[PDB]
Amino acid sequence: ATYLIGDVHGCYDELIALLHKVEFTPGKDTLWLTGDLVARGPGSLDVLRYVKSLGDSVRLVLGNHDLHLLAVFAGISRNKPKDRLTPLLEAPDADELLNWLRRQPLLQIDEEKKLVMAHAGITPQWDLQTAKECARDVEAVLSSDSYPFFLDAMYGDMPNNWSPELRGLGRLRFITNAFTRMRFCFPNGQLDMYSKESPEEAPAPLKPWFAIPGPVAEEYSIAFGHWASLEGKGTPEGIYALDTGCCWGGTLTCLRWEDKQYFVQPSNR
Template sequence: MSATYALGDVQGCCAPFTELLQKIGFDAQHDRLWLAGDLLNRGPDSRPLLKKLFNWQDRLQIVLGNHDLYALSRWAGIVPAKKSDTLGTLLSDKNAGDWLDWLRQRPLLHHDEELGWTMVHAAIHPDWDISSATEHALQVQEALCGPHWKRFLKSLWAAPAPDRWEDCRNEEDAQRFRVAVFTRARYVTADGRFNWPSTPPKDLAHIYAPWHQWFFERQSSGAIICGHWATQGLLVHERLLALDSGCVWGRQLSAARIDLSEPQIHQINCPTYAQPGN
């Protein structure tokens, strides 16, 4: 019997990734693997990880995270290396173009009607049901797959994303907002104002809540798999699997088998690859 597993943020930690797949008995010939974004960067082994995923692509479902978009932007020569950048070995590989061109065409949202799960890297706007969120994600994917994808990536870095959907003045603003929601969001207010940095200012913290709190209050359907929020840690609720458990920070890498009536959680402990502020 084949199985479907979802994993949280790997971030270039290829050895723990391999160890966890061995622990759960993942069979690349028969099983399927969902990865909730932030595949690359910060950890030491983005190159062997992306090579492995490229070779397994027929068994994979990937959504892009903020670090993946950063890696694509680095490859395209749009942004300089950050202090925490560990992409040098990957970007210098002769096959990097093939691997990253494939990665560029991955979506920001995946919905499986049969399994009943929807996967994003960070969040879904509380006012978007699964159907409308899928349409918003498709707008981004079409831009990334199109002939002007470099121009699109460059525009994402050209200005900050608006805090609210209502504040988008043009399509470039709308695309920045969509990308920010799907790949960076954590906290949002009741009226849909996002705080893009990790933590809201202390004097305003009382008006913000985790995005999923508002989403589940407003949307009567939709079960979400996500990553991105290592400080929140592993969360397992009836309609939420938040799987970023901080592997790159020396905590755990988490997987969930999602083709069962109740998800089964599997974890391994990870070495510390990055330090806070790195």
């Protein structure tokens, strides 16, 4: 069976309880995770140890908090106490875990399931070939020996409009924002990097990225996490918003792909 789970945010106990609920069995089953494995919840260290141990039985995409963790580890960014990352950063296997994490994809595609996953979704300005190329480019910088330079370059809110002519720092910044920070778009598809509200609460003319027809969404189902204020609700057919805010006192959500059956684990917080 195929299981897709939204943002874990250090909620190790809830993750394991939910996997036990569905009797997740590596070798029979595959788990997809929307990223943001770490921060806020108490168990980021245990989450990374477990997910790394799954090997080919897990298909991960990196989220914005995973990248922030890498930036803290590399000395690029300051540690925020509320993220509760110190046990992971101080662990004797921190290097092993974080060098594995920075090698993981930004984008997962299964052609037989016609299923795409990224942390924030797929901007309507991208077709599939462009999304693949951009994921490859950023994965290449993250898996290189020079990844601290890219992590430093990644921060920024511009440019917010895709063009194949984009080059350099702006190109990498846009790619990172589209895969890991996107929520709202302007009517022309341009990213808004400020509004984090639910769609009903957003200022006009902002609309969810998935409310603008894009070429990937027309051919593929898209699973994503990230957007907790969406509460996993309000999406069109073929769009699966799996982040139901476990670390916020919400729930951890698991979707089984074969029958589109949902399983939910309440937050312990």
